[PDB]
Amino acid sequence: NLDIIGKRIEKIKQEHETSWHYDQDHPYKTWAYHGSYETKQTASSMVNGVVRLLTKPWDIIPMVTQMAMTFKEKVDTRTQEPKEGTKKLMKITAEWLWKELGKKKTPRMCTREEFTRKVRSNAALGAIFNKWKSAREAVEDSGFWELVDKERNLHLEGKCETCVYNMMSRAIWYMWLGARFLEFEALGFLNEDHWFSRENSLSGVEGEGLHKLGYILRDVSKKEGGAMYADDTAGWDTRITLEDLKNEEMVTNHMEGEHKKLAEAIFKLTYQNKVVRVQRPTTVMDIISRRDQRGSGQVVTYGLNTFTNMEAQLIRQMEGEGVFKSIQHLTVTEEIAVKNWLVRVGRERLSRMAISGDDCVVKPLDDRFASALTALNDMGKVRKDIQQWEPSRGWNDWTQVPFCSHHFHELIMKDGRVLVVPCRNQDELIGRARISQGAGWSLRETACLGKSYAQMWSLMYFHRRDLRLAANAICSAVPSHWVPTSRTTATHEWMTTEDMLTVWNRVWIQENPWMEDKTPVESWEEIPYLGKREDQWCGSLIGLTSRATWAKNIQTAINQVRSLIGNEEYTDYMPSMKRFRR
Numbered sequence: 001n002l003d004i005i006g007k008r009i010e011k012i013k014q015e016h017e018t019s020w021h022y023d024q025d026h027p028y029k030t031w032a033y034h035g036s037y038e039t040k041q042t043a044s045s046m047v048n049g050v051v052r053l054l055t056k057p058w059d060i061i062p063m064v065t066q067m068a069m070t071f072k073e074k075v076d077t078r079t080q081e082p083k084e085g086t087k088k089l090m091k092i093t094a095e096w097l098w099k100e101l102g103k104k105k106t107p108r109m110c111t112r113e114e115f116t117r118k119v120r121s122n123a124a125l126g127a128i129f130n131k132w133k134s135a136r137e138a139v140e141d142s143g144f145w146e147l148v149d150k151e152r153n154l155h156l157e158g159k160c161e162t163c164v165y166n167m168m169s170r171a172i173w174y175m176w177l178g179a180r181f182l183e184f185e186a187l188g189f190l191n192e193d194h195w196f197s198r199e200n201s202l203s204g205v206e207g208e209g210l211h212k213l214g215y216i217l218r219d220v221s222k223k224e225g226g227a228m229y230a231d232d233t234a235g236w237d238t239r240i241t242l243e244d245l246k247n248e249e250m251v252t253n254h255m256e257g258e259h260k261k262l263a264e265a266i267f268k269l270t271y272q273n274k275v276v277r278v279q280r281p282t283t284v285m286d287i288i289s290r291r292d293q294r295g296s297g298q299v300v301t302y303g304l305n306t307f308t309n310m311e312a313q314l315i316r317q318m319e320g321e322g323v324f325k326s327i328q329h330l331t332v333t334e335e336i337a338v339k340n341w342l343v344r345v346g347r348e349r350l351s352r353m354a355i356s357g358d359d360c361v362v363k364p365l366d367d368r369f370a371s372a373l374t375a376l377n378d379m380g381k382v383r384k385d386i387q388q389w390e391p392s393r394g395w396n397d398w399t400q401v402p403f404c405s406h407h408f409h410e411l412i413m414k415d416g417r418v419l420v421v422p423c424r425n426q427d428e429l430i431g432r433a434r435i436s437q438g439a440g441w442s443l444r445e446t447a448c449l450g451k452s453y454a455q456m457w458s459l460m461y462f463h464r465r466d467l468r469l470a471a472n473a474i475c476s477a478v479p480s481h482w483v484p485t486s487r488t489t490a491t492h493e494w495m496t497t498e499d500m501l502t503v504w505n506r507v508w509i510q511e512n513p514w515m516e517d518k519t520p521v522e523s524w525e526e527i528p529y530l531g532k533r534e535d536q537w538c539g540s541l542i543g544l545t546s547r548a549t550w551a552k553n554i555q556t557a558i559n560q561v562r563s564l565i566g567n568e569e570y571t572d573y574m575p576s577m578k579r580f581r582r
C-alpha cells in the first residue's frame with residue numbers, strides 16, 4: 001500500500017496545496033480514495049463531409065445517422081480471489097506458456113531511438129498535453145530525457161514518483177509520455193518482436209490482418225472436434241485479478257540485468273499498484289488507487305490480454321477433457337497430469353484457438369467444453385449475455401462465427417479460386433467512415449481520411465456492391481495524388497498511393513499462402529461479389545429506389561465534391577465497374 005503509491009500521492013498533493021481536501025461524499029466503494037483538488041475542463045465525434053456527400057441514401061438510415069450523435073459502475077466493482085486449485089492451474093499454465101512463447105524469441109529493452117521514431121510517425125501511445133505542446137516536441141528536448149532518467153533511476157531503486165494514470169464498456173488510461181516510454185522500454189518487445197504472431201504463439205493473430213483472419217478460422221474448422229465456441233467476457237479489463245497480474249509478471253523470469261529490474265518495476269509499481277486521476281462533476285479531480293484490473297498502455301494491454309486469455313482457454317479445455325476434477329484443490333498427481341497434458345498436447349490445443357486480446361474462438365476436442373464452467377467462472381472471466389451455469393452455445397459453421405467484430409464468407413471467383421473475405425453489417429461500415437475525431441481538419445485532410453476508408457473498402461469489402469461503388473466514387477472525388485491519412489493508425493495495406501488493383505493482387509493472390517495458383521487478376525470485373533441475397537442480408541441497399549438513383553446519378557455526386565475541393569487533378573474510377581463501362 002502507501003509505501004509504494006504515497007510518493008506519487010504526496011507529489012500531487014503539493015502541486016494543489018491550496019485545494020487539497022478529503023471530500024466525505026466520495027462515490028468510490030472498491031477504489032481506495034485519497035483526496036480531491038480543483039480543475040475545470042472536459043471531444044465529440046465530427047462528420048466527414050466528403051464521405052457523407054457520397055453516401056446520400058444512408059442520410060435517412062437511423063443505424064448510420066445515430067452513430068455520429070452524442071460503464072464506470074463496472075470499473076467500481078471487485079473480483080473475488082480464485083480458489084487454491086484454480087491458482088495452481090493458472091501458475092502451472094502461465095509458467096509453461098511463457099517458456100513456449102520464449103523458445104524462439106529473446107526479451108530485450110526497446111530504445112529511446114525506437115520510441116522517438118514511433119512518436120514522429122503518429123501512433124496512439126495514449127499520452128497527455130504541461131511543458132511541451134505535443135509528444136513530437138518533448139522527444140527532441142533533452143530536458144524531458146533527464147525527467148525520464150530521474151524516474152528510471154527511481155525504478156531501479158524500486159520506487160515511483162510520476163507514473164500516474166488519467167481516466168477518460170471502455171476506459172482509456174493516459175499517462176505522461178515519460179511513464180509511457182518506461183513502459184515501452186521494459187515491455188514493448190512483446191509487440192515490437194511479435195510474441196503473439198500465429199507462428200510464435202499458435203493461438204495468436206498479432207500482425208495477421210483482416211484478410212487472413214477468415215482463412216485462420218477455416219484452418220481451425222478443419223480440426224476434428226466439437227462446435228466452435230466464441231464466448232465474450234463481460235468487461236474483461238475489470239476481471240483481471242491480482243493473481244492474473246502475478247502470472248503475467250513471470251515474463252521477467254526470462255529477462256536479465258537492467259531489463260529484468262526495469263520490467264519488474266513496471267509490473268510492481270504501475271500494474272500491481274495504480275494511482276489514477278478522475279474528473280468528477282460534483283468539477284474536482286479525485287486521486288484513487290487499486291491493486292487489480294487492467295490499466296496499462298493499450299499495446300501492452302493487448303499482449304497481456306492475449307496471454308491471459310490463451311491461459312484461461314487452455315484451462316477451460318483441460319476442464320472439459322477431465323484433466324482435473326475440482327478447482328477447490330489440485331492433488332499432487334493432478335499437478336503432474338496437468339504438466340504432462342501441456343507437454344504432450346499443449347501446442348496442439350493452442351492451434352485449436354484464435355485469440356485477439358479478450359476475443360477468442362476455440363474448437364475443443366468435443367462439446368464437454370460447453371458445460372466446463374467452474375475454472376472459467378472462478379478465474380472471474382464471466383461470460384456476457386448468458387446465465388453463469390448455462391452451457392455455452394457453439395457454432396456449427398466457421399462462416400457464422402463472430403471474431404474481431406466480423407464474420408467471414410467463402411467466395412468463389414469465376415476462375416474457381418477461393419477467397420475467404422471479412423464482412424460485417426454494412427450500416428456499421430458506412431456509419432464509421434462518416435465520422436472523424438478531433439478539431440482543425442482542413443478540407444484536404446477530411447478528403448484524405450475519406451480516401452483511406454475508400455481504399456480499405458476496395459481491399460477488404462470489395463465483395464459488397466454498395467461499398468465497391470462508394471469506394472470508386474470517393475477515389476474519383478479526391479485528387480488522384482493526395483495521400484490517404486488517419487489520426488489513430490491489423491496490417492494497413494490500403495494506406496498507399498499505389499494503384500488499388502496492384503495492391504489487391506499482392507494481398508489476395510501473390511502473398512496469400514492459401515492461394516496455390518498465382519495468376520494475376522487483370523481487372524476489377526474478375527473480382528466477385530457475395531450473392532445478391534447474401535449482400536442484402538449483410539445490409540446492402542441493392543433493390544431500393546434510393547440506391548438505384550444514387551448509383552445512376554453518381555457522377556453528379558462526384559462532381560459536387562470535386563467543385564468543393566476545386567481545380568485539382570482527378571481520375572474517373574467508375575468505368576472499372578461493368579455498368580459504368582459504356
Ligand SMILES: CC(C)(CO)NC(=O)c1cccc(Cl)c1
Nearest residue numbers: 465529532542543577578579580
Ligand atoms: C455489380 C453490378 C454493377 C453488375 O452485376 N450490379 C449488381 O450486381 C446489381 C446492382 C443493383 C441491383 C442488383 Cl439486384 C444487382
Ligand SMILES: [Zn+2]
Nearest residue numbers: 160161162163
Ligand atoms: Zn514510475
Ligand SMILES: [Zn+2]
Nearest residue numbers: 407423424538
Ligand atoms: Zn456478411
